[PDB]
Symmetry: C3
Subunit: 127 residues, 3 copies
């Protein structure tokens, strides 16, 4: 039960850790498009989606794993009009790391912390 | 990590796989009431509820497992007034397969992919 | 294992789910709502609701033989983010009082929850 902490993903806005590493598997908190350096949220959904994903990647990479070890995501979104766009960025991101797509749920919620357009949690396995 | 692929469940409409088998645990994507043979979404909530659960079954069977191996489900729905009808179908489903009911979370979201009334993810264990 | 968890210190399952499942290495709970197990009532105030959801989570993990410090992931479904700073405070004090490290978390505002409660919380805990 190792805690994961990285500056490549935003610090906790709250009583949670960024990730926990169980040995066989890794859980991340839900990541929002907040910039780890600047604390800023990008306006466009293309960018928010790239940024949530990088934030997830930082925690998974800080555990010593890679994108291809990601087996499950939930993508929580505020607007299904943004859907094809989120999917393009998210495919590109997996393809970039030559990783097969994880299992996934995608739901439209009412609202997200800081009024972001999306939030992504992940589960990775070691082997 | 072994990807699960079956034609008894709908082909992914985006960058995901229907299931992943970790040896120990199997994760499904969130199953919506899309008909694997036609692409149709049934109109009635009873039929939609029945149909997500058959899609979940289909992926868990393809992994070599069965419905009584499911330990967790998350049921995302668009209307809590549909709950008693969803509960009836879902109870019958597990009862039919002589299955112990899993842990479950049920929440009403704003909207789902393809304007479906529910989306169900499952987690199963091998032994 | 696939052991069902059953406790009277959390509200009983009336419906097609069980309170929790113990798998050996990990415990999963059902989503817990702020329904009081003795009175069957929902407190009106979100701090009370938050505290109670957490109690209800604790009851089931503890019935599994584990403790709060073993909880490794939560998802907090809420109906109003305006309640969030308040829920966070209650949630923090709950972990601090158990001397527990904070789990991983996801928090979203959904449209609605069972019984019009203000939050539902599910938990994943590991044995060691």
């Amino acid at each position: 039960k190792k805690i994961i902490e990285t500056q490549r993903a935003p610090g906790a806005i709250g009583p949670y850790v960024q990730g926990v590493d169980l040995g066989s598997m890794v859980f991340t908190s839900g990541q929002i498009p907040v910039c780890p350096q600047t604390g800023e949220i990008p306006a466009d959904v293309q960018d928010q989606a790239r940024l949530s994903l990088e934030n997830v990647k930082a925690i998974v990479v800080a555990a010593g794993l890679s994108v291809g070890d990601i087996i499950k995501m939930t993508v929580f979104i505020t607007d299904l009009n943004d859907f094809a766009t989120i999917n393009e960025v998210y495919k590109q991101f997996f393809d970039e790391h030559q990783a097969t797509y994880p299992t996934r749920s995608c739901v439209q919620v009412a609202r997200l912390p800081k009024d972001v357009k999306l939030e992504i949690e992940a589960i990775a396995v070691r082997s």
